[PDB]
Amino acid sequence: QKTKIIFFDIKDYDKEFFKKYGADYNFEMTFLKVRLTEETANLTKGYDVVCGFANDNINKETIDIMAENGIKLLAMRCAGFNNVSLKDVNERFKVVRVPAYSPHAIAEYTVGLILAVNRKINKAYVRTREGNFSINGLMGIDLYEKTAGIIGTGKIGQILIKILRGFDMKVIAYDLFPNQKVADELGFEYVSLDELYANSDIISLNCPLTKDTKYMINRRSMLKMKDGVILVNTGRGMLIDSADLVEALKDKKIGAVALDVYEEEENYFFEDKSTQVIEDDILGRLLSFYNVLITSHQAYFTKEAVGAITVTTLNNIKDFVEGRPLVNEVPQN
Amino acid sequence: QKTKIIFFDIKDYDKEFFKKYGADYNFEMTFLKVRLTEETANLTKGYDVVCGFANDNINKETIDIMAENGIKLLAMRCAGNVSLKDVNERFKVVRVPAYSPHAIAEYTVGLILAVNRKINKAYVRTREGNFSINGLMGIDLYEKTAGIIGTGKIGQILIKILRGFDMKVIAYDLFPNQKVADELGFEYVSLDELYANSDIISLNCPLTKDTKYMINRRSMLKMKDGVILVNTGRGMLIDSADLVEALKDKKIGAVALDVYEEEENYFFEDKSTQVIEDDILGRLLSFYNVLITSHQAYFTKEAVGAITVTTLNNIKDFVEGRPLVNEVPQN
Amino acid sequence: QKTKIIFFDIKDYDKEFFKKYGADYNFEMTFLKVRLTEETANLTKGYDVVCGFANDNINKETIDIMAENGIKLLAMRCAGNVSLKDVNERFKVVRVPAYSPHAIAEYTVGLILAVNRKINKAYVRTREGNFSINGLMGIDLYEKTAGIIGTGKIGQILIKILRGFDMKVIAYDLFPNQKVADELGFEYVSLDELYANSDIISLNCPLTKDTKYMINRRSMLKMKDGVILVNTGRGMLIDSADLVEALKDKKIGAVALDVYEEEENYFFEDKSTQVIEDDILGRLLSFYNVLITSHQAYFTKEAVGAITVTTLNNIKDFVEGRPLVNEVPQN
Amino acid sequence: QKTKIIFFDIKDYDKEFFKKYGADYNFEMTFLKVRLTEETANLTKGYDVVCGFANDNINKETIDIMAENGIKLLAMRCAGFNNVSLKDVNERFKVVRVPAYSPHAIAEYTVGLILAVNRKINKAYVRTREGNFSINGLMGIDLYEKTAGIIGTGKIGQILIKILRGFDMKVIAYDLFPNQKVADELGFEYVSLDELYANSDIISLNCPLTKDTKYMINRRSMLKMKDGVILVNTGRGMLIDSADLVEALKDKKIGAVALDVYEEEENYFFEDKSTQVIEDDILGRLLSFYNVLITSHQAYFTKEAVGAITVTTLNNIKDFVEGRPLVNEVPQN
């Protein structure tokens, strides 16, 4: 009678959110701790809907077993789907995701990254954990009255800008669709890229990836920046030409950099590669610089974000069962 | 003919700033990284001025050696650790506080976010090639309540930053300034109200008999489960043994400590190759949700330039026979 | 028609070895990394055989669920943690020890050297770009005395390795084998002699009422200052609270623990995002000269192949109606 | 009257060794905690002899001040002297060092490195320190009955071989001056390089650096090795073509590698570069591989070695004062 959903890779918090928000939905929900892989795909027997996540390995064999079991929808409770062999589904079931949003989580994370690399909080941690309370080399800069250059004045950039204005930073910004009323309200100034590069003590990337923003941060543009600039990217990996970023670090143009995204993150992120070789030379090199901080696309990861993802997942499933268009469908080609 | 100054505990930019701001004064400056203790006090021979730092051990023997060497002024950068009564007017003592309000408020926000979003933990994973984010979920600050204990200048800067996050802010101080509360958009409350309602609590108040161990088993009982606590004020504001129990009980969600009630035995030094004798500190260092840093909230280029200048002004005032603004009085 | 086996706690080479050595038997194998607890016990539905590991929590509820699902055999890899009396003959239980003597002796020498020469500490420095070696001085093993407690097969292998270093070796066992002592070149001694004379002490003996807390405040008092202690035997051989005091007093120079008296709450799991409730363990983890590893002395490719084979032989014997050599008897 | 010696960078243990062993020498010894640099060089006033160490910065200005102060000998209590501006001394004083020996410390260290990388002891440490008691990915191999290939059968190689024979490894070895009696006594077999490469599960470099051993471990020779080989070098940095070592790691030819020496260690070793950029790409890349362990020329560092260095330093100084040839002189060109 009720729609039967099997969930994989569930943590206590996921379970509580699905039971809490799903109370209104008329689904019958079973929560498993294991990931969805070919070892576990036969547990989908008897279910109508499978809910998956970023650690699953949803390959051909997994897909085949779920289709044979008559699964009709695979709902990913995340924005990525690189772990799904889309080409093998063949419309045997639909696939849906949850697009990234959570703009406060991400703007807040960005400021946490700026401060962590500016003030060396990660490095201090590793020292004190080992009983080393020396602070030599950990000096940073005050943000007060420095200039933040914000690339992108969407919803994430606006939240970011309002926080940095709270630090009494001076804020300049670049966007192809500037909004002068928001600039008046938050107290920042729109400028060209050239002006932003020349004048900014810290630079954050908060703009979408298009042909024109692809590798916008590269050798040429970093030459225009101030020596010692702090760069942060929680937007998209491909906004930065990573190889050039390595040279600018070496030349000392870039004072520090924090990356929550990476141009070839698909091969690395969300996975523990701590016991295997990292084949990407540029990533392996970035990980050895004292002033590089990398994190694995975690800017979103707050309980509020997770709760909204949970809601979107339940709405995804309801829309499917009611035959509505799937706005979060992942197309199979 | 030149005034001779020997510096101990030299770190980032100390040498360049002292040289730059000390020019045109006829100073001759010797810059050591080592600390001042009885084992290095002999190096003060032939100097007019010794300039030290908070972790020096300036005990009676150290004092006697410098007095014997005829030093005239001992100037302590960033200190609160001199055995002042053994000096006995043999030389003057100066103490230059590391009061740098922007640096410290900004650091506090960096600590809140680091422990909330587990940035330090992520770093240790990704450096080792582990890109899993399991267990690293935090909370949004937006629309949460921040409880700020102390509304001096560091607290005000902090509050204006957190109001930028659109946190709701309440605060406690014995000398409230309602004009600033109206300007920054916060509300003054009692300690009991602050404990009950705050999702984040920051300590930015002076250490008195009454604030000593104000955060303790009873007060932490009144806090919300999962509260984030940060302390960049003074170590003694927190009963550290009770803090260990409140972590175990899971009352405290996460804690960042830039100060520690017995930091004088540990801070600013590398003890990575010796035993830490303090049980409580050794225990705090093994919690997943404790971040300790070594009193480094002050540590920016701008702060250090201002401290350096204040230090040199005291030295110049001494040499020109004016009052030493930062002199520690004896008698 | 196929025998169905579900594996929990799968790690390095488990899947490949079970597949390789299990071929030609008509087994159908499902391989999970998760652990077996009441929250995963339902996954055993439809299986004939469950194959678990030492950190599973096989409590009454877990047992009841597997019995309800009709499992016939629970085979525990590397265990000592099943609530055996709740089983009540509803299924058979097997326990396959992680006894692998070369792996374990070799690991022990790697632990001695790691803590002596501070290799682990160096790693954390150089990974961060710190190539200073200050504080990392060790001692030569050549001509020092090694005290080996237990001369079973793991102890014998260890002793032959340390004799290769030209260490002098003394040993304690209640069942001494003088022929092996003549062959390997060591001398049997009392515990008091071993404590007094040993620069290195390794525990490689079984846990009985008499060896329980044999290393404690009194016995460590008899040891030489700066002694290196290693334990890859059993956690309970050491009174861990006394070990904390002996570290603080500086009696113990360095200690490597592959086992811990309460390891059953911690080992084999990632607790990096939760509180460690055990005070003593949290304190041991903050000493510079403590190295703890999670019962991994066994963990080589060869050991695991042999354990895998023994596991599969028990399963095959079950299916063919022969005695299960590693069955844990009930009644 | 007595010869006056000023010592820099003294640790408690150094002091105790100099007082203990110098009791027979008739020197007057002053021990300072500070390093010798231009900030401290005027403390050499009134002394006849300066005793220095690897963290000193003995540059032109330092040299000039010591010469003006009438220093006659600079004794380095270490084997290196890259931190001395030799060209500026101009025979104003002599410079002596202590050549490396301590063969037990170094053979013992080598085995500690082999085991650390084989058994992942360093990685386990970082995990348990963080409260992670998982052992996934930490599996090693038994040494028993595997084959160790030892390049160099000098005093260090012989000690190493006797230890590994204690593990009941099979040992084969290469040396240009083989000693068949030592091979009979220790139970190993001499072989060609080609045979050693083809047959060894672990390989240790314990041979001197000459034209023929320079980059002997390179692309071509590592192609001949077994996949998964464990390589250890406590001999000299230049025995390995480091760039090729990075490619062999990536290809998975090398299973793990432990380096106590590095071909351009002069720029890095003994110094804390944890708050600055590492300009050497190859070093920065090596530091990010899971199966690379680097340590800073510490194989020697035991109390026995330090005590012998102390003795050699005192003998250095006595030989100088008595006008004997200085066998440990560092020539100034």
CSV table of N, CA and C in Angstrom, one decimal, chain D residues 32-85:
chain,number,residue,atom,x,y,z
D,32,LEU,N,76.7,27.5,26.3
D,32,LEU,CA,75.6,28.4,26.1
D,32,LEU,C,74.5,27.6,25.4
D,33,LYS,N,73.3,28.0,25.7
D,33,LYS,CA,72.1,27.5,25.1
D,33,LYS,C,71.8,28.1,23.7
D,34,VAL,N,72.2,29.3,23.4
D,34,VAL,CA,71.9,30.0,22.2
D,34,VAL,C,72.8,29.4,21.0
D,35,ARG,N,72.3,29.7,19.8
D,35,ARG,CA,73.0,29.2,18.6
D,35,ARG,C,74.0,30.3,18.3
D,36,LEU,N,75.0,29.9,17.5
D,36,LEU,CA,76.0,30.8,17.1
D,36,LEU,C,75.5,31.4,15.8
D,37,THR,N,75.3,32.7,15.8
D,37,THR,CA,74.8,33.6,14.7
D,37,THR,C,75.4,34.9,14.8
D,38,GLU,N,75.2,35.8,13.9
D,38,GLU,CA,75.7,37.1,14.0
D,38,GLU,C,75.1,37.8,15.3
D,39,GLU,N,74.0,37.4,15.8
D,39,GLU,CA,73.5,38.1,17.0
D,39,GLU,C,74.3,37.7,18.2
D,40,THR,N,75.0,36.5,18.2
D,40,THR,CA,75.6,35.9,19.4
D,40,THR,C,77.1,35.8,19.3
D,41,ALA,N,77.7,36.2,18.1
D,41,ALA,CA,79.1,36.0,17.8
D,41,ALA,C,79.9,36.9,18.7
D,42,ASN,N,79.5,38.0,19.2
D,42,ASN,CA,80.3,38.7,20.2
D,42,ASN,C,80.5,38.1,21.5
D,43,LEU,N,79.7,37.0,21.8
D,43,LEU,CA,80.0,36.3,23.0
D,43,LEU,C,81.2,35.4,22.9
D,44,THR,N,81.8,35.3,21.7
D,44,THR,CA,83.1,34.6,21.6
D,44,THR,C,84.4,35.4,22.2
D,45,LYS,N,84.2,36.6,22.6
D,45,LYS,CA,85.2,37.4,23.2
D,45,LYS,C,85.9,36.8,24.4
D,46,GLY,N,87.2,36.7,24.3
D,46,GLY,CA,88.0,36.1,25.3
D,46,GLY,C,88.2,34.6,25.2
D,47,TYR,N,87.7,34.0,24.2
D,47,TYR,CA,87.8,32.5,24.1
D,47,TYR,C,88.8,32.1,23.1
D,48,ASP,N,89.4,30.9,23.1
D,48,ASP,CA,90.3,30.5,22.2
D,48,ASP,C,89.7,29.6,21.1
D,49,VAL,N,88.6,28.9,21.5
D,49,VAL,CA,88.0,27.9,20.7
D,49,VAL,C,86.5,28.0,20.8
D,50,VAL,N,85.8,27.9,19.6
D,50,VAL,CA,84.3,27.9,19.5
D,50,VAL,C,83.9,26.6,19.0
D,51,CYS,N,82.9,26.0,19.8
D,51,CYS,CA,82.3,24.8,19.4
D,51,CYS,C,80.8,25.0,19.0
D,52,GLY,N,80.6,24.6,17.8
D,52,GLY,CA,79.4,24.9,17.1
D,52,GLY,C,78.7,23.6,16.7
D,53,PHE,N,77.5,23.8,16.0
D,53,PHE,CA,76.7,22.7,15.7
D,53,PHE,C,75.8,23.0,14.5
D,54,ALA,N,75.0,22.1,14.1
D,54,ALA,CA,74.2,22.1,12.8
D,54,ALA,C,73.1,23.2,12.7
D,55,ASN,N,72.6,23.8,13.8
D,55,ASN,CA,71.7,24.9,13.7
D,55,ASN,C,72.3,26.2,13.7
D,56,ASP,N,73.7,26.3,13.8
D,56,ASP,CA,74.3,27.6,13.7
D,56,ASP,C,74.2,28.2,12.4
D,57,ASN,N,74.3,29.6,12.3
D,57,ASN,CA,74.4,30.3,11.1
D,57,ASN,C,75.7,31.1,11.0
D,58,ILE,N,76.7,30.4,10.5
D,58,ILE,CA,78.1,30.9,10.7
D,58,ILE,C,78.5,31.6,9.4
D,59,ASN,N,78.0,32.8,9.2
D,59,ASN,CA,78.1,33.6,8.0
D,59,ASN,C,79.2,34.5,8.1
D,60,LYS,N,79.4,35.3,7.1
D,60,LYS,CA,80.5,36.2,7.0
D,60,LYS,C,80.7,37.0,8.2
D,61,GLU,N,79.5,37.7,8.6
D,61,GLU,CA,79.6,38.6,9.7
D,61,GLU,C,80.0,37.8,11.0
D,62,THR,N,79.5,36.7,11.2
D,62,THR,CA,79.8,35.9,12.3
D,62,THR,C,81.3,35.6,12.4
D,63,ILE,N,81.8,35.1,11.2
D,63,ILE,CA,83.2,34.8,11.0
D,63,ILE,C,84.1,35.9,11.3
D,64,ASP,N,83.7,37.1,10.8
D,64,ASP,CA,84.5,38.3,11.0
D,64,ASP,C,84.6,38.6,12.5
D,65,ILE,N,83.5,38.5,13.2
D,65,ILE,CA,83.5,38.9,14.6
D,65,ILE,C,84.3,37.9,15.4
D,66,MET,N,84.2,36.6,15.0
D,66,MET,CA,85.0,35.6,15.8
D,66,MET,C,86.5,35.8,15.5
D,67,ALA,N,86.9,36.2,14.3
D,67,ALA,CA,88.3,36.3,13.9
D,67,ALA,C,88.8,37.6,14.7
D,68,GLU,N,88.1,38.6,14.6
D,68,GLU,CA,88.4,39.8,15.4
D,68,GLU,C,88.6,39.6,16.8
D,69,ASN,N,87.8,38.7,17.4
D,69,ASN,CA,87.9,38.3,18.7
D,69,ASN,C,89.1,37.4,19.0
D,70,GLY,N,89.8,37.0,17.9
D,70,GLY,CA,91.0,36.1,18.1
D,70,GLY,C,90.6,34.6,18.4
D,71,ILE,N,89.5,34.1,17.9
D,71,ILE,CA,89.2,32.7,17.9
D,71,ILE,C,90.2,31.9,17.0
D,72,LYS,N,90.8,30.8,17.5
D,72,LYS,CA,91.8,30.0,16.7
D,72,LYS,C,91.3,28.8,16.0
D,73,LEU,N,90.2,28.2,16.6
D,73,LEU,CA,89.6,27.0,16.1
D,73,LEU,C,88.1,27.1,16.3
D,74,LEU,N,87.4,26.6,15.2
D,74,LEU,CA,86.0,26.4,15.3
D,74,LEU,C,85.8,24.9,15.1
D,75,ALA,N,85.2,24.3,16.1
D,75,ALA,CA,85.0,22.9,16.1
D,75,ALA,C,83.5,22.6,16.0
D,76,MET,N,83.1,21.9,14.9
D,76,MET,CA,81.7,21.6,14.7
D,76,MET,C,81.5,20.2,15.3
D,77,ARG,N,80.5,20.1,16.2
D,77,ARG,CA,80.3,18.7,16.7
D,77,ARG,C,79.2,18.0,15.9
D,78,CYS,N,79.5,17.8,14.6
D,78,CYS,CA,78.7,17.2,13.7
D,78,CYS,C,79.5,16.9,12.4
D,79,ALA,N,78.9,16.2,11.5
D,79,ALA,CA,79.7,15.8,10.2
D,79,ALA,C,79.5,16.9,9.1
D,80,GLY,N,78.4,17.6,9.2
D,80,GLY,CA,78.1,18.7,8.2
D,80,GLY,C,78.7,20.0,8.5
D,81,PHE,N,78.9,20.9,7.5
D,81,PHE,CA,79.4,22.2,7.6
D,81,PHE,C,78.9,23.1,6.5
D,82,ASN,N,77.7,22.8,6.0
D,82,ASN,CA,77.1,23.6,5.0
D,82,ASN,C,76.7,25.0,5.6
D,83,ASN,N,76.6,25.1,6.9
D,83,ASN,CA,76.2,26.3,7.6
D,83,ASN,C,77.4,27.2,7.9
D,84,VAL,N,78.5,26.9,7.4
D,84,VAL,CA,79.7,27.7,7.6
D,84,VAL,C,80.1,28.4,6.3
D,85,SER,N,80.3,29.7,6.3
D,85,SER,CA,80.8,30.3,5.1
D,85,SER,C,82.3,30.2,5.0
